[PDB]
Write a protein that binds this ligand. Structure first.
Ligand SMILES: Nc1nc2c(ncn2[C@@H]2O[C@H](COP(=O)(O)OP(=O)(O)O)[C@@H](O)[C@H]2O)c(=O)[nH]1
Length: 160
């Protein structure tokens, strides 16, 4: 009865984040008709997960899944400077969709354990987050391997 979308490039840390969220909680894979989206239920929250930037981004059939989404979590690999422009494009296409009008936006700046990664300030600048006025948003440094920063992101969602 809570619905959250979690998106990001392949290798961003999505599944690692969901593992962390699932520790000491009830978790199961909820069957989905397609092979595009994976639905992971953790307690009473349904997380809908997919990779951005592929063939499916040419179509975005997953926009049927936007209905009633409470939060969009965008996972960014803070080391992947080459591809972050792809995430940016996809973020703004999502924010334009009328079915996500009510959603809050949580950006996880993941892999902040890694030397020379982009800083949270730099990611925020690159993504123009200060431009986002019609959705509430938060950006959060994390390391999904250890879980550091994940509880802060969860609290932001729970505060809302
Ligand atoms: N160094 C580091 N590696 C990470 C972090 N989060 C995830 N990884 C690793 O990056 C790879 C991709 O992560 P994964 O969760 O499978 O990404 P997904 O494709 O978005 O689901 C795996 O080898 C993870 O162990 C992190 O915060 N720091």
């Amino acid at each position: 009865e809570h619905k959250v979308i979690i998106v990001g490039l392949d290798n961003a840390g999505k599944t690692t984040i969901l593992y962390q969220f699932s520790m000491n909680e009830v978790v199961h894979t909820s069957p989905t008709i397609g092979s595009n989206v994976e639905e992971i239920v953790i307690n009473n929250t349904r997380f809908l997960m997919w990779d951005i930037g592929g063939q499916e981004s040419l179509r975005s059939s997953w926009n049927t899944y936007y209905t009633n989404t409470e939060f969009v979590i965008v996972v960014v690999d803070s080391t992947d400077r080459e591809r972050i422009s792809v995430t940016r494009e996809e973020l703004y296409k999502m924010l334009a969709h009328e079915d996500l009008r009510k959603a809050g936006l949580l950006i996880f700046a993941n892999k902040q354990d890694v030397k020379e990664c982009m800083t949270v300030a730099e990611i925020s600048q690159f993504l123009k987050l200060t431009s986002i006025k019609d959705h509430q948003w938060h950006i959060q440094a994390c390391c999904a391997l250890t879980g550091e920063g994940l509880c802060q992101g969860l609290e932001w969602m729970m505060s809302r």
